[PDB]
Amino acid sequence: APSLWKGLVGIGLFALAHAAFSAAQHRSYMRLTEKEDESLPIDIVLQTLLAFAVTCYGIVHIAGEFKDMDATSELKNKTFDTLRNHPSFYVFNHRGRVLFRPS
Amino acid sequence: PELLLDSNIRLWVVLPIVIITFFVGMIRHYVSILLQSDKKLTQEQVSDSQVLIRSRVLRENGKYIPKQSFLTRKYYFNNPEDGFFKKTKRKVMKGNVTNVLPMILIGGWINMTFSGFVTTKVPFPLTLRFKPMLQQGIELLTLDASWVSSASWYFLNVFGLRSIYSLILGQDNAADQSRMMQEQMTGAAMAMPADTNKAFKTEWEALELTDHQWALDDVEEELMAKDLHFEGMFKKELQTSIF
Amino acid sequence: PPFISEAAVRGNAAVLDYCRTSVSALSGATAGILGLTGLYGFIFYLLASVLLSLLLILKAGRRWNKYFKSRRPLFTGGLIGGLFTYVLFWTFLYGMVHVY
Amino acid sequence: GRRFKWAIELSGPSLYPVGYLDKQVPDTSVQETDRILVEKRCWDIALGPLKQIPMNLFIMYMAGNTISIFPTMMVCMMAWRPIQALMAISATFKM
Amino acid sequence: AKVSELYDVTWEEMRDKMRKWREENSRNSEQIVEVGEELINEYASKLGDDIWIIYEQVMIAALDYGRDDLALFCLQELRRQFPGSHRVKRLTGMRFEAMERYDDAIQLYDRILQEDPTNTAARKRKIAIRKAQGKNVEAIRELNEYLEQFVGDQEAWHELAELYINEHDYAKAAFCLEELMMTNPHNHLYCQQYAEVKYTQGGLENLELSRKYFAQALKLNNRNMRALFGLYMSASHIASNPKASAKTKKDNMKYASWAASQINRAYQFAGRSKKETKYSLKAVEDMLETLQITQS
């Protein structure tokens, strides 16, 4: 799922860049002709707004963690069996050691 | 829109200045990380630091504690006869977040290199009293203040990426074994100053100022209730098998 | 509610700020691509921020109490710094296309 | 008792323990409520912002009337500190 | 199943699973070693920072399981990258203590202490060495001295409590578990263990305190059935004792009866999972009925 969102964001960014290039070409043509104070066509403006909204949707979905405020639910499935043993004090005197000695 | 500019000035000014400021910020961050040095720590200072943490957790979490043990702890800390805080006594340019000088120097060098230039105009209407700010090298009185020079461009650029820098970077939390050592280091770095006597007296009086309110007495609230979470919870524990 | 973990709150705040920054940065690029007056640009930035806030609220929906204690930071948060980084990218592509 | 049948019973036969005390030492009773000093302290805390203005007045006088980056940056943050302190007066008022 | 498990797997999932194993600090030295040398021979390309901790964990597991050859194989690689590192020295001393000649690991620990004054790991390993070498009383003494000198480690508190458990000293273990509960009030496990220790002590007031702490941890998680069993047994025992008030006996009987219905329903909706759960349900049903006749 995240890969699809990343691809959609990339496609939206590419569409935005293409709309930018089209607007730049429009302004370059406008500089050619005297007067004719007209705005850029509305179709490209709608396309760039569509690219603005599409990339704005996946940018929220990419980084969603929203971890729970309560910390009692994170030590909830953990049992006391694993907590009893500690990495610090570790005695290497067990029957399994001499059981596994020969293979 | 006027003042037709060349297309070969935008490719030799804007991109260079943007890359320069970006990588200057990156250099500053990485060099600050590199120059960071650890501080020597005496076992005694760690000792009183952990004692202070213990007093703090006693103050914070004291409701879920038997009353007898609570007064035992409070007496041991206080102990008017001997007391541990009372007897145990020990014996006793202007660099201020230097980040403005480098940016000022970089902006000054950039402005010195570019004498007469027009980088970009700002859409925002600006007054004529900021014209000496913005141009600083162009001899024009009829021109508007919208067209700014490279100095203001870089000045706005350094603030433009201030929040962008944190997007690439972030925080780190690992090394469970080294986490404890980090906690001791930071806590004793808090407890560096040599004012042990007044801190001990302040903590001694603050501990007396605390009262006791056993939060365990309110048990009747749970007895009259409903246990239905323990089967919606139990239904979602069954599907998982054993690896 | 009695016990609160600071790590979860910090992560939530970091995610919210990252989203607010990225959305503002792209809104600046859009405004620079179109090119408007200051009043219209500021109103457009405010509209984009409101739309982002509405989408963020819709993202949570049900069970938002455990996710966020309140809603004030979701509505009002990162409005000045986000505008500061939006002004950069608004004028970055504005004069690059029109003036140049 | 025999009603429970199975009844496993467990018996127990230098002061190194940190807090475990041989002597119980009860009879602690502290009733101290000194609100007037707290009120005087909190009253003086709210007087700090009123006194924090005169030296910024003196600094703005020392700045002069020269249009430059350093003075305008001083002035921009001179008013930002109050407005940033006025964005969260609700919590301070409540506490 | 070995080849089958080795087929439907990726290296990323292996590394994530081992990271989770390290987070849970479980004992699966067999499985840790089994996946350890596999990622060492299959990928052996990148993630050096991860692979250092990987090597350390693998040799820790191999010291436990059966294999010192891989232990030395990882020791030489760890020494190659870091010439002077106290962690490698501690691990080597641990392996030496495992093999023979504990005194050599001992003077290694004193040299480590001479170099770095603040080294908790070396002192903990010395304490564990004298735990198994001599009597536990001396080890308790040194642990108390170190806990005086730091007063920072919760693992030291829990180890002291566990060591005091074998000596039938619940008076000091009560203080130890109270201190351990101070720092972590949301951990119901420590509350359950403290209530367990207090119940074992005996006495009506200790019984009431243990019952109330059993009840506190019951509402924090709603996951544990040990706590509810302990609460029901405490209520039954306080009902048994003649030295009590009438009204407290009635309310404790009500507590026990409600716990009985909770037991009945918890075993009841567990019966729809399998077809052999009905026998466990009837077993626990006769158990509760017999204790109900006993109480009534």
Author numbering:
A (entry chain E): 2 to 104
B (entry chain C): 4 to 95, 111 to 261
C (entry chain F): 11 to 110
D (entry chain D): 12 to 24, 41 to 122
E (entry chain B): 2 to 297
Please share excerpts from the published article on this structure:
The ER membrane protein complex (EMC) is a multiple-subunit complex that is highly expressed in the ER membrane and plays a central role in the biogenesis of membrane proteins. Specifically, the EMC is responsible for the post-translational insertion of low-hydrophobic transmembrane helix (TMH) of TA proteins, as well as for the co-translational insertion of the first helix of some multi-pass transmembrane proteins into the lipid bilayer. The EMC contains two distinct transmembrane cavities - the hydrophilic vestibule and the lipid-filled hydrophobic groove - present on opposite sides of the complex. Here, we present cryo-electron microscopy structures of human EMC in apo and VDAC-bound states at resolutions of 3.47 Å and 3.32 Å, respectively.
To address this issue, we applied various computational techniques including optimizing the box size of particles, selecting particles with maximum resolution of 4 Å, and utilizing no-alignment 3D classification. These efforts resulted in a well-defined class of apo human EMC with an overall resolution of 3.47 Å. The apo structure of human EMC exhibits a tripartite organization, of which the luminal and cytosolic modules are consistent with the recent structures of human EMC. In the transmembrane module, a three-TMH bundle of EMC4 adjacent to the EMC3-EMC6 core is ordered, forming the sidewall of the hydrophilic vestibule. Collectively, our human EMC structure unveils the complete architecture of the horseshoe-shaped insertase cavity of EMC, which is enclosed by the L-shaped EMC3 segment and the nine-TMH bundle of EMC3, EMC4 and EMC6. The insertase cavity opens laterally to the lipid environment of the ER membrane between EMC3 and EMC4, creating a ~24-Å entrance for the assess of substrate-TMH. The most striking observation is that the EMC3188–210 segment undergoes a dramatic transformation upon VDAC1 binding. This segment forms an L-shape architecture in the apo state, playing an important role in the formation of the hydrophilic vestibule. In the apo state, only a portion of the TMH2 in EMC3 is visible, which protrudes away from the hydrophilic vestibule. In the apo state, two dynamic elements located near the entrance of the hydrophilic vestibule TMH2 of EMC3 and the TMH and C-terminal cytosolic loop of EMC7 remain idling in the membrane, primed for the binding of substrates or cofactors. Within the hydrophilic vestibule, the EMC3188–210 gating plug adopts an L-shaped conformation to provide enough space to house the substrate-TMH. Taken together, our apo conformation of the EMC denotes its role as an insertase ready for substrate binding.
